[PDB]
Amino acid sequence: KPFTCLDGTATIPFDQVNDDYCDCKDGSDEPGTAACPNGSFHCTNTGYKPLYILSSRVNDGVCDCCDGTDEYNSGTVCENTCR
Amino acid sequence: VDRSNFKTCDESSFCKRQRSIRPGLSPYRALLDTLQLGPDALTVHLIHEVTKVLLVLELQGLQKNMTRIRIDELEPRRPRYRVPDVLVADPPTARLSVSGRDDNSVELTVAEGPYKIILTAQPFRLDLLEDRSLLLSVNARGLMAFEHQRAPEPGAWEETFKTHSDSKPYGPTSVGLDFSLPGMEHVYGIPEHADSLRLKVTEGGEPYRLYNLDVFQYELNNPMALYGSVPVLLAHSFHRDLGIFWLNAAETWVDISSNPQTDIRWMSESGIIDVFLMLGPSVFDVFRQYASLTGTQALPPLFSLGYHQSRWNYRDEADVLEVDQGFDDHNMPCDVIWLDIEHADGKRYFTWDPTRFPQPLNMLEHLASKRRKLVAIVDPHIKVDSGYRVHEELRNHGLYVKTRDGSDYEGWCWPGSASYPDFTNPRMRAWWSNMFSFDNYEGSAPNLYVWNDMNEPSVFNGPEVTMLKDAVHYGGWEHRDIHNIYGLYVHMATADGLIQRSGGIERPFVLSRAFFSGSQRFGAVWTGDNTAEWDHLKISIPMCLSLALVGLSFCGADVGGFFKNPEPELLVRWYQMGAYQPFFRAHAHLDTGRREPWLLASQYQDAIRDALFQRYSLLPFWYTLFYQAHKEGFPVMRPLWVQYPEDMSTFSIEDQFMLGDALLIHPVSDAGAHGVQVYLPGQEEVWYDIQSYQKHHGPQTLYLPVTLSSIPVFQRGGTIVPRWMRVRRSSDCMKDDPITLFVALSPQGTAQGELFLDDGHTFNYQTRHEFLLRRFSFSGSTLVSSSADPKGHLETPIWIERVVIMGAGKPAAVVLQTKGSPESRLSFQHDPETSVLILRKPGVSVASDWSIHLR
Ligand SMILES: *[C@@H]1O[C@H](CO)[C@@H](O[C@@H]2O[C@H](CO)[C@@H](O[C@@H]3O[C@H](CO)[C@@H](O)[C@H](O[C@H]4O[C@H](CO)[C@@H](O)[C@H](O)[C@@H]4O)[C@@H]3O)[C@H](O)[C@H]2NC(C)=O)[C@H](O)[C@H]1NC(C)=O
Numbered sequence: 001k002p003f004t005c006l007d008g009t010a011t012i013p014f015d016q017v018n019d020d021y022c023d024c025k026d027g028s029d030e031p032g033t034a035a036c037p038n039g040s041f042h043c044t045n046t047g048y049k050p051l052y053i054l055s056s057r058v059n060d061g062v063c064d065c066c067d068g069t070d071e072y073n074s075g076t077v078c079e080n081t082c083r
Numbered sequence: 084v085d086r087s088n089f090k091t092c093d094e095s096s097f098c099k100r101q102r103s104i105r106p107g108l109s110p111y112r113a114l115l116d117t118l119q120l121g122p123d124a125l126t127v128h129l130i131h132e133v134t135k136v137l138l139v140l141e142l143q144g145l146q147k148n149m150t151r152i153r154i155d156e157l158e159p160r161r162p163r164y165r166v167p168d169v170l171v172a173d174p175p176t177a178r179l180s181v182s183g184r185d186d187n188s189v190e191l192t193v194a195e196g197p198y199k200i201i202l203t204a205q206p207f208r209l210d211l212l213e214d215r216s217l218l219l220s221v222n223a224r225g226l227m228a229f230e231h232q233r234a235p236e237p238g239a240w241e242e243t244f245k246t247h248s249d250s251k252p253y254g255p256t257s258v259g260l261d262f263s264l265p266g267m268e269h270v271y272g273i274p275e276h277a278d279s280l281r282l283k284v285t286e287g288g289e290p291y292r293l294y295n296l297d298v299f300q301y302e303l304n305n306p307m308a309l310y311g312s313v314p315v316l317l318a319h320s321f322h323r324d325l326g327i328f329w330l331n332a333a334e335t336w337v338d339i340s341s342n343p344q345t346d347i348r349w350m351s352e353s354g355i356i357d358v359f360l361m362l363g364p365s366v367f368d369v370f371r372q373y374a375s376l377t378g379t380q381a382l383p384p385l386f387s388l389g390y391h392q393s394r395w396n397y398r399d400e401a402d403v404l405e406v407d408q409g410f411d412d413h414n415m416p417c418d419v420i421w422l423d424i425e426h427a428d429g430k431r432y433f434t435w436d437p438t439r440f441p442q443p444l445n446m447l448e449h450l451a452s453k454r455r456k457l458v459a460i461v462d463p464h465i466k467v468d469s470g471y472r473v474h475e476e477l478r479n480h481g482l483y484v485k486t487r488d489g490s491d492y493e494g495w496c497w498p499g500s501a502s503y504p505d506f507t508n509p510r511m512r513a514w515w516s517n518m519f520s521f522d523n524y525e526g527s528a529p530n531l532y533v534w535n536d537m538n539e540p541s542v543f544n545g546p547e548v549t550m551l552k553d554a555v556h557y558g559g560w561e562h563r564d565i566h567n568i569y570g571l572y573v574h575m576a577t578a579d580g581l582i583q584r585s586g587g588i589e590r591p592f593v594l595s596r597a598f599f600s601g602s603q604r605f606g607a608v609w610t611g612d613n614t615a616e617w618d619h620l621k622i623s624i625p626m627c628l629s630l631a632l633v634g635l636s637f638c639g640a641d642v643g644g645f646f647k648n649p650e651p652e653l654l655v656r657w658y659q660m661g662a663y664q665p666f667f668r669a670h671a672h673l674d675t676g677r678r679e680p681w682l683l684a685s686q687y688q689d690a691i692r693d694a695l696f697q698r699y700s701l702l703p704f705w706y707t708l709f710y711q712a713h714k715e716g717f718p719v720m721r722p723l724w725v726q727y728p729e730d731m732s733t734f735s736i737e738d739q740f741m742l743g744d745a746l747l748i749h750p751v752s753d754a755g756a757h758g759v760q761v762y763l764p765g766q767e768e769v770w771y772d773i774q775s776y777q778k779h780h781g782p783q784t785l786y787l788p789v790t791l792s793s794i795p796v797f798q799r800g801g802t803i804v805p806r807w808m809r810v811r812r813s814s815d816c817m818k819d820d821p822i823t824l825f826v827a828l829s830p831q832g833t834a835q836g837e838l839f840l841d842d843g844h845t846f847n848y849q850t851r852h853e854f855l856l857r858r859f860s861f862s863g864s865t866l867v868s869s870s871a872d873p874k875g876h877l878e879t880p881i882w883i884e885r886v887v888i889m890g891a892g893k894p895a896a897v898v899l900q901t902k903g904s905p906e907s908r909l910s911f912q913h914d915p916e917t918s919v920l921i922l923r924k925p926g927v928s929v930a931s932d933w934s935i936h937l938r
């Protein structure tokens with residue numbers, strides 16, 4: 001059952017995936033949070049070109065994705081601007 | 084510098100007259116039959132034996148180990164100036180009791196002891212003691228000189244400097260007095276000078292000069308007066324600390340001489356003799372004493388402690404937005420972008436160029452969407468233009484400084500012909516504050532802050548590039564009487580403007596060039612127009628340390644140097660130095676090439692990004708040091724001798740400094756350096772290299788190897804430093820993030836540190852007690868979080884995500900206890916080579932009490 005970092009540096013239970021603490025040197029355990037310094041967040045931008053942003057831009061209060069999915073618990077409510 | 088544009092002591096008639104008096108028997112004597120003693124003061128008449136002029140001495144013991152001495156004429160032709168608005172309160176007094184008296188002396192006890200004052204009648208002298216220890220003598224060399232006001236001697240009356248004639252209606256009125264400091268060999272302070280931290284003896288040269296002046300291309304290691312003046316001198320020895328605060332706003336010269344004993348002489352153009360003797364005994368006692376008189380450092384809004392990007396000038400709105408986007412495209416944090424004088428309509432302040440900045444509110448809204456701020460320049464000179472509303476209003480209300488003939492003074496400055504508002508007039512200050520309302524300053528918004536430059540005041544065609552000595556201010560006082568507080572009033576009125584525009588809720592951010600005692604209450608200062616050279620990078624340490632010692636903790640120097648083009652290596656080293664100094668701004672002159680940090684080659688960009696990330700991660704530590712400065716009046720940036728007062732090898736160090744009691748910084752400041760000599764003080768002290776975690780025992784000089792990305796920083800054993808390890812694009816983005824605690828164990832296995840948190844920008848910490856002040860303490864295998872101030876409560880999502888312990892062995896288990904939760908087991912990682920233990924995700928609120936036990 002456990003998760004293995006995409007770089008092979010550690011094996012952790014699934015409960016340490018998106019748990020808002022960085023456990024992988026490549027940041028692969030935190031794709032959905034701002035916890036890893038070298039992670040990436042995927043902007044799905046449904047109906048337009050997808051983009052990846054720095055993990056430090058997830059819930060920073062700034063609208064980075066045109067779909068606004070990077071801001072889900074920050075207090076900034078982002079509007080969909082993909083067109 | 085063009086030294087011929089600035090007076091030497093021989094070219095200032097009052098300095099030449101005062102300095103010509105050499106040590107001897109004073110002609111002043113106290114008339115003890117006139118002695119009167121009350122609960123608040125002792126008063127006695129003094130007489131000059133030759134001229135028969137009568138003066139009045141008002142001698143006071145004060146609470147917190149201070150003494151105040153005031154001397155004025157008994158029957159003056161006209162009142163002498165007494166400095167207003169610098170003192171924050173009428174200082175609480177201590178009663179003087181006569182414990183001894185004869186025909187030539189009176190011994191006074193302060194309260195119930197141990198301090199005593201001996202007044203000798205002939206020659207007039209004061210001796211200040213603690214029990215049988217003589218601390219200081221006054222008029223010991225008989226250099227007291229009080230030029231009485233004569234009926235309204237080369238240059239004693241009318242006096243010319245170059246083509247400028249000072250009409251000098253009141254003639255010679257200078258005052259001066261000497262102080263002797265037995266056992267003292269090291270003295271500091273009296274900024275602003277581009278000189279050494281430990282002050283030099285002035286015997287064979289010029290005295291130090293305190294006269295706020297705009298000095299173009301100023302040079303290093305000399306006593307010429309620069310932009311600000313703080314008339315406070317500190318004296319340090321192994322045994323004691325003392326301070327002298329000479330409360331006078333006129334041009335002042337300070338002579339320093341050695342014998343072990345240091346003698347100090349103050350010579351001022353006008354006003355009274357008003358001096359505070361701050362008797363310590365520790366340097367922290369002196370800081371508290373001075374803070375009781377002039378207040379403490381205003382708590383900066385958090386964003387102002389981030390990185391500021393400036394130049395003269397960003398071209399237009401598109402350039403500002405491109406610079407903003409450049410920081411984000413290159414993953415470099417930045418809180419503020421600055422707009423110099425070209426943003427205005429032809430240097431009419433409070434306006435916007437209609438081609439370059441047509442939509443300032445839209446520019447401010449875009450910066451607000453990135454959680455960034457802007458700073459706009461507003462100088463205290465107003466273009467003479469009948470179409471300019473600010474000029475028309477000030478002219479119509481008579482709020483400008485006047486010449487003797489009653490006409491509004493007009494000089495030359497950035498807008499060409501300009502007038503100078505009289506900031507000493509309280510109605511002019513009220514008008515100025517009101518001009519910052521969002522309705523009056525059209526195009527401004529809450530994320531727009533202010534920079535006051537040229538507030539000495541700078542007058543391009545004036546004597547010494549400033550205002551005429553005989554210009555007239557509020558109440559009929561001459562410019563010579565008030566000069567050194569003009570800039571402080573500009574700073575004060577601007578800060579009040581930013582507070583009032585928000586309805587009193589938002590903390591201000593104002594940078595000022597000119598300053599005086601009390602300027603710490605209004606914002607930040609910087610060392611002015613420095614140059615892109617290695618020696619100017621080096622001198623930023625003693626200049627900001629001299630300011631820190633006299634209460635001005637929010638100091639910095641232009642990163643990269645203002646004048647000329649720095650080589651990339653120098654720009655990198657300057658970012659690293661600036662990253663560890665309180666006010667961190669890159670700024671550059673009009674004719675320099677662009678130097679936004681992403682314009683350099685990748686190796687240099689990477690070293691600069693590293694320095695920015697270090698600074699941003701340390702913001703919780705910086706904010707806490709500023710909270711301690713605001714509450715106690717203790718400096719943020721400190722000389723090593725403040726922390727190691729008995730280590731005589733630290734007394735003159737100026738290539739290294741400390742931040743609080745926890746970090747020791749030795750920035751690289753030479754081209755092609757491959758190592759630095761770091762002095763790590765302290766008997767039984769340990770220091771951790773914050774990058775490698777290597778432990779070093781003090782006292783020692785360590786030769787540390789360095790590369791381009793190196794910033795030599797050591798954490799003292801016994802301290803706990805808080806950091807935000809998730810570096811984002813600006814401080815607003817980070818201010819609700821989790822904290823990592825860096826625990827550096829002492830040889831006894833202990834450590835402590837504090838953490839201040841609030842909303843980052845309002846006065847709610849003071850009006851609603853909405854803040855947290857935590858104490859973290861480590862001893863005997865347990866780390867504990869407790870409240871350091873139970874009055875402070877704050878709703879915050881901030882939690883503890885990690886603990887890094889340096890100097891720890893490998894535990895078998897790590898247990899966390901917190902009220903309201905069951906006991907928790909934490910995972911950990913340990914490096915046996917460095918003895919570094921990392922505790923994974925404690926997960927506890929920073930507002931809660933908790934304990935972590937190892938084994
Ligand atoms: C106002 O002034 C008074 C008088 O100076 C001042 O009180 C004094 O404070 C000093 C501390 O600065 C006290 O000194 C201590 O004395 C005790 C013995 O009485 C010593 O044990 C202490 O030793 C420590 O420090 C030494 C180095 O200085 C170390 O060698 C040693 O290992 C210890 O760590 C220390 O010498 C002094 O006793 C009092 N004096 C009186 C009369 O109270 C007061 O703090 C000042 N107040 C303000 C508000 O400024």
Ligand SMILES: [Ca+2]
Pocket residue numbers: 016017018019020021022023029030
């Ligand atoms: Ca994780």
Ligand SMILES: [Ca+2]
Pocket residue numbers: 057058059060061062063064065070071
């Ligand atoms: Ca975002």
